[PDB]
Amino acid sequence: SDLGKKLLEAARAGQDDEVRILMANGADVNADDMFGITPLHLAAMVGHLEIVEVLLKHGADVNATDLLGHTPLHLAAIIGHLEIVEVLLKHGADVNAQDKFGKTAFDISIDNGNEDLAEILQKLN
Amino acid sequence: SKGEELFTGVVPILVELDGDVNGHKFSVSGEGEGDATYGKLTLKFICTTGKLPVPWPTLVTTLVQCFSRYPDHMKQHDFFKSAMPEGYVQERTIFFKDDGNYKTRAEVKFEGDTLVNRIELKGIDFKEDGNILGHKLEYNYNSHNVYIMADKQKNGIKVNFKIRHNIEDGSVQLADHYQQNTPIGDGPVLLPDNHYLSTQSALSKDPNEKRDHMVLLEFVTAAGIT
Ligand SMILES: C[C@H](O)COCC(CO)(CO)COC[C@H](C)OC[C@H](C)O
């Protein structure tokens, strides 16, 4: 709870040793804020690869959704962090997941001009 | 712009609205964070005067477009951040179809290191048993296109869009938004080519909060230029 809040803020800030220590001290890897955002959402959004891997190895939900139905993969498509996309998919992220307004990570990629990421995602159908 | 540098991380937000709708006086205070690199906003709002006399969804547009994401190919078109930190005045008239209207004036600017949106809202001509004063709006929100053009002569922007409010009977109440933004400072701003913002908003409750309140998550990305 208190550890959950700290875990969120460490994930957003890219503080990898803080993430590891917080989880060793029992922070819930799947803690969320009142907006439904988890540590894996934040690390995927910002492109913090080592944090994403640590969270996933400790059982972070790759299919977690925020209030808008965005998964970590949706958020990784905003800037287009390829190594993070790859890891999420290797852990079973649903490439076709739709947010509550029907948008996919492909759609987000296109909106951002992430043309190469869009091509990758398209080939996985 | 130099203004966009203020938005590269997480910025705390305060929102303070003073409202009068058909003589019903109310106040709203919000606080949270904006993460404009991702077009992300997270806010919680409280009615500080008791119960809100209008539905929460009718106030969402009134309650910081500087936190929109402008993708790399669109950075030259971001008026909102270019006006910062001195900020901008944001005025609207919102016409609820077959009902009354809101008029709003807001100042959006940095106060210390916090982005603050201070608003005055006046609503008139609402029907006592219409969808607004009768509270017939679903507690939800749609996804919109916010159309933007430069007003080069007045060094600002003009904005227009309609909000779709779902009604509990399956109908939709339209709210037609007419909007202008004007820089507060004398410094140069970015005057955009025509484009739009694609908006997504979700409304929730805090299970620990007993006051009349609204939890809001938004994601907004500019589009319409390739
Ligand atoms: C012209 C059309 O009916 C819509 O009218 C828009 C207008 C006049 O053009 C009506 O008041 C102006 O509304 C936008 C401005 C910014 O609102 C000013 C004040 C805060 O109500």
Ligand code: NA
């Ligand atoms: Na409401």
